[PDB]
Design a protein around this ligand. Sequence first.
Ligand SMILES: [Zn+2]
Ligand SMILES: [Zn+2]
Length: 190
Amino acid sequence: SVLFPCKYASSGCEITLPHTEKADHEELCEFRPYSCPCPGASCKWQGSLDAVMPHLMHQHKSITTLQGEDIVFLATDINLPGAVDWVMMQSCFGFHFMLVLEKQEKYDGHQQFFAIVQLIGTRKQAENFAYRLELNGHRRRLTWEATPRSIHEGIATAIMNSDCLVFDTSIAQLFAENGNLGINVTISMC
Ligand SMILES: [Zn+2]
Ligand SMILES: [Zn+2]
């Protein structure tokens, strides 16, 4: 049983495991760098958790940040052929929750939206929360509630498995007013 240091020991991590069992700790390890949480898979910054807020303050100034624990995100122009994602930050409970709406294109000539929120915080910190996403309309409500993913884990593997609010364009137009979609976001503790 010959032991190896974790890949991220050069960041402070002091664990040593057998060459096989690296996988587990190696991507649960808190010393793993955080990738830029923006749904834009085009900004490939990395760095430490404390640095994430700086990096968005600096390189993603166009992100609207919202009041408190129950807000309404107005995603504008969801039917624009060019529009592909909306993003914004919600400040409550002394944390920040990044809300991202990703438009993707599948079988139809149409698109599906995916909506999910992540916590600016650890995997452990994120389990103490839940979030709810509401699309509201005339005698209609589509709701999704789940546990926000930590930015450490990311949303890509959750988008992949539809583990978030999921809708296509005809659902959008049911709830879209003009070309804008109002998404009620509620964060809570648990
Ligand atoms: Zn480690
Ligand atoms: Zn970035």
